[PDB]
Amino acid sequence: QDGLINVRGGQYGRELIVHINGKDVAKYKIPDGSQPEHVNNTDAQWLAEELAKQMRTNLSDWTVNVGQGFIHVTAPSGQQIDSFTTKDGYADQLINPVTHYAQSFSKLPPNAPNGYMVKIVGDASKSADQYYVRYDAERKVWTETLGWN
Amino acid sequence: LNTLGDNGALGQAPYIHLINRDEHEQYYAVFTGSGIRVFDLSGNEKQVRYPNGSNYIKTANPRNDLRMVTVADYTFIVNRNVVAQKNTKSVNLPNYNPNQDGLINVRGGQYGRELIVHINGKDVAKYKIPDGSQPEHVNNTDAQWLAEELAKQMRTNLSDWTVNVGQGFIHVTAPSGQQIDSFTTKDGYADQLINPVTHYAQSFSKLPPNAPNGYMVKIVGDASKSADQYYVRYDAERKVWTETLGWNTEDQVLWETMPHALVRAADGNFDFKWLEWSPKSCGDVDTNPWPSFVGSSINDVFFFRNRLGFLSGENIILSRTAKYFNFYPASIANLSDDDPIDVAVSTNRIAILKYAVPFSEELLIWSDEAQFVLTASGTLTSKSVELNLTTQFDVQDRARPFGIGRNVYFASPRSSFTSIHRYYAVQDVSSVKNAEDITSHVPNYIPNGVFSICGSGTENFCSVLSHGDPSKIFMYKFLYLNEELRQQSWSHWDFGENVQVLACQSISSDMYVILRNEFNTFLARISFTKNAIDLQGEPYRAFMDMKIRYTIPSGTYNDDTFTTSIHIPTIYGANFGRGKITVLEPDGKITVFEQPTAGWNSDPWLRLSGNLEGRMVYIGFNINFVYEFSKFLIKQTADDGSTST
Amino acid sequence: NDVFFFRNRLGFLSGENIILSRTAKYFNFYPASIANLSDDDPIDVAVSTNRIAILKYAVPFSEELLIWSDEAQFVLTASGTLTSKSVELNLTTQFDVQDRARPFGIGRNVYFASPRSSFTSIHRYYAVQDVSSVKNAEDITSHVPNYIP
After folding, report:
1. How far apart are CA B172 and CA B215, in angstroms?
2. Residue B296: C-alpha distances to residues B51, B291, B293, B340 (Å)
3. How far apart are CA B515 and CA B636, in angstroms?
4. CA-closest candidate to residue B578, choices B469, B496, B471, B493
5. Distance, in angstroms, between B116 CA and closest chain C CA?
């Protein structure tokens, strides 16, 4: 139903693309860097806002919220996210898609909406049992919690 | 109690097991060699359904080939003749070529670096990144632009191949006929820009960040931890790597070749089904081998340390902890104490394991010629499990050893007569067990063919059923005072010459017996009651066999002959062959009927003088009590209890 | 069927299972964490025999905890510290026990009833001298079998 889009920053000449449900809902080409003002367009928050407004126009009834270094995109009650990919051209350092599943605790998004629930799968390095973590916005920590449903 | 059917109702040599869950869940499951007939202890046939067929229970010798283990949750049925087989049809990725597919990670680019990909001896794509002089040269260093630029060159060079651009990677797929033989990429930046990704990775940290949905990678290992090679699969919609079963790997066994279960349904009837055995979920045939029972026959089913256990050949096959139907590890990457245990009994002689006997805070695995104690040093794991030969006593495999109190009774057949032994723990020694022949003074008493050993703890007896003399129930009466056998009484019970005893089990001093004469099969109960009559209104507890309470119906009395003739099959629902018949009236009048020369079946009538219509009577067969004294000779004892004549 | 205490845990007897709570937390029958395994985690294991064994009573006897069924007696131990892995249920004896009357311990002995068809036998459960770990039950009503209805 819900997903996150971390925005760690930008690099010159990199095309920021987010792909949802078979469509490229938002595409932004970062300026080449010739002009001095091009360093203003590499700011993560500016990129997050720029990608969000394109997503809002493409996804009419969806809910798109810009957080601290991330984009919170929520499908309406009827719909859901079926395909969720982001392309940045910088080996996922600029933007990466965040689902409700993470490989490990270190792979959790640095910032998330309050109460965001992530299932930790495991790195297949220790005898592992999958568990759940919830983000505390006012505490800025991830705490193990009961699973959903 | 009831008549179960005709003489052949339960087959020639049925295997009969008592299911005793609660006060209202008492049943016999009779395995006749062609099906299961279930009777409650009142004698009412329940229905046994076969959703998955009855081929598992079809055998010539149910006693030799079928074993029944009942616990609170399940009733397992194992056929000792059926060989467990693996499901060769169920293959994960049935025809998988690791060299068929490949990936090309594109993490970015750097100025002045020549991107080269080399496939099958040819440079299928070559791109020189611009030197960086022009401002737009930073557009040519984008990974997706680089991924697309190489892909179109790959498509032109590799005409029939499939080249797809993913998120930071290039997915190149060979056609069905072809495959990737040489797969190298050159970027000139220490593999930071592009690196080739095959279906093998050194470790988990070396997995590609993004892959197509379901991409399968085998993890070899960093040679830093004791490592077992495992497989991972990428979930595109979840963006995680999960351990999975290897490619070209068979995961399931044929459930029809595996032990079955008998389950009571809601309607009070029973269903004979297979069990849903969990398949292999990780590894391959090498890392996750088939259990030892595969290709062999399971001889026994048991439970130890919250695991399900099998006895197959010389091996003990324990399931995963708390998961009875799973005989495979949860993970191959990591070793868990919960992993299933598959070890063979380790002796210098042939030892096929037939029974698992829980005895004296230990689990004992019994073979024909040897007994083993299944122990573990510390917690029971695959490494910790130990099978130590404790004793070497011959044990008959038809009759499961029977435990009463501190003792386990088993049969050891000889050439002509069966020796019954008591398995016990020696008092002084910490870990020495012993078997004592309790039939040493009667070695030629119980004929060979012992198929049932039973008894009652409350009544302090052990009963042996042998097919050498089917008419007899051999009774071992014992008493224990201060760790001493104060009573050792061997005798037998007889119910008729043509009568055969198929099963007899005790439930708190009530002994429910299945008997079979030459016409019918019966259910009957022996109760060790002190001063209680058996049937309502009886003048006294009459000592008769096949004792029944009968109200004489109308029309039986014939005034032309002045006799009330009752019809024995009307009374019992069954015919009889021989034996004196006694009719007991409530006032105490007894009329005895001798056998007709042809038998009771030829003339199944009891002619009682006068009109007895509407009167309740008590019919039974006279019990022939025999006791022969030993010769009245002078008996002396020594300082000890040893006797002399 | 029964409530008992063992190694600072609350215990239940249900069917053929022993359900021990979390250590020092009697009303918690769930692990504190799924990400990590703790020795304090609750223990839920079944008695492992080839015969039906419904557990009715938990009898503390002779430096051990005895789990009593209608037809068998089990010694609840652990190899080392009592954890989920180390817990063992070992059949020590097979004596018929009435489930209406809880076994009564006096001194070194435990007394219990075993009903017969018409009169009840009372037995004394005790430890044998020579053997390290063999327990026994002796009928103290052997000379009066038809005395207690």
Report:
1. 12
2. 25, 10, 5, 18
3. 44
4. B496
5. 44
Give start and end residues of each alpha helix (H) in chain A: 44-58
Q: Is the dihedral of CA C77, C81, C82, C86 positive or negative?
A: negative
Do A63 and A73 touch, CB atoms closer than 8 A?
yes
Can you point out the beta strands (E) in B467-609?
472-480, 485-494, 500-506, 510-516, 520-527, 544-551, 557-558, 563-567, 581-584, 590-593, 605-609
Whole-angstrom distance, CA of residue C4 vs CA of residue C13 = 8
**Resolution for this model in angstroms, one decimal place?**
2.7
Name the burial class of residue B356, with classes exposed (0-12), middle (13-18) and buried (19+) by CB atoms within 10 angstroms of its CB.
buried
Alpha carbon dihedral C123, C129, C134, C135, in 10-degree steps, equals 20
> What is the spatial distance between Cα B569 and Cα B168, in angstroms, rounded to a whole number?
88
* A contact chains, 3+ CB pairs < 8 A: B, C
Quote the tokens at residue C102: 């809880």
Interface B–C counts its CB contacts (< 8 A) at: 126
Query: Would you say how long chain A is, in residues?
Result: 149
**CB-based contacts of B189, cutoff 8 Å, min separation 6:** B110, B113
* Mutation for testing the C interface, residue in A118, A119, A120, A129 having most C CBs under 10 Å: A129
Cβ-contact B399, B355 below 8 angstroms = no
Whether C91 and C46 have beta carbons less than 8 Å apart is answered as: no
CA B497 to chain centre: 36
Tell me the C-alpha to C-alpha distance, in Å, between residue B97 and each of A7, B207, B212: 38, 19, 16
> Residue B222 CB: number of other CB atoms within 10 A?
12
CA angle B22, B23, B24 (to 5 degrees): 90
What order do you get walking across the sheet with B485-494 strand by strand?
A: B450-456, B461-466, B472-480, B485-494
CB B454 within 8 A of CB B504: yes
Residue B2 phi/psi, 5-degree rounding, is -160, 165
Name chain C contacts of A129, Cβ cutoff 8 Å: 34-35, 37
Residue type, C36: N
Please list every residue in chain A whose beta carbon sits closer than 8 Å to the beta carbon of residue B241. 103, 121, 124
End-to-end CA distance of chain A: 14
- Choose among B260, B161, B271, B167: nearest CA to B210: B167
Please state, in angstroms and as integers, the Cα–Cα distance from residue B35 to each residue in B38, B48, B66, B77, following that order: 10, 8, 12, 13
Q: Would the CB atoms of A124 and B232 count as touching at under 8 Å? A: yes
Q: For residue B522, give the amino acid letter.
A: F
* Nearest to B78, CA basis, from B337, B360, B298, B227: B298
Q: Residues for chain C: how many in total?
A: 149
Q: Are B371 and B364 in contact (CB under 8 A)?
A: yes
Method used to solve the structure: cryo-EM
Give the amino acid at B433.
Answer: K
For residues B247 and B233, what is the distance between their CA atoms, to the nearest angstrom? 11
- Chains near C with 3+ CB pairs less than 8 A apart are A, B
Gap from B346 CA to chain C (nearest CA, Å): 23
Which one of A103, A120, A126 would you mutate to disrupt binding with B, by most B Cβ within 10 Å of its Cβ? Answer: A103
Side chain identity at residue B641, one-letter code: G
Contact A130 C33 (CB under 8 A): no
Distance CA B429, CA B410 (A): 22
Q: Chain C partners of A132 at a C-beta cutoff of 8 Å?
A: 34
For the beta carbon of residue A131, count every other beta carbon within 10 angstroms.
19
- Element (DSSP H or E) covering residue B26: strand B26-31
C56: left (phi over 0), alpha (psi -120 to 50) or beta: alpha
CA atoms of B268 and B113, how far apart (whole Å): 78
Question: Residue C118 and residue B529: Cβ atoms within 8 Å?
Answer: yes
CA separation for the pair C27, A50 (Å, rounded): 52
State the Cα–Cα distance between residues B571 and B551, nearest whole angstrom.
Answer: 9
Distance CA B549, CA B289 (A): 62
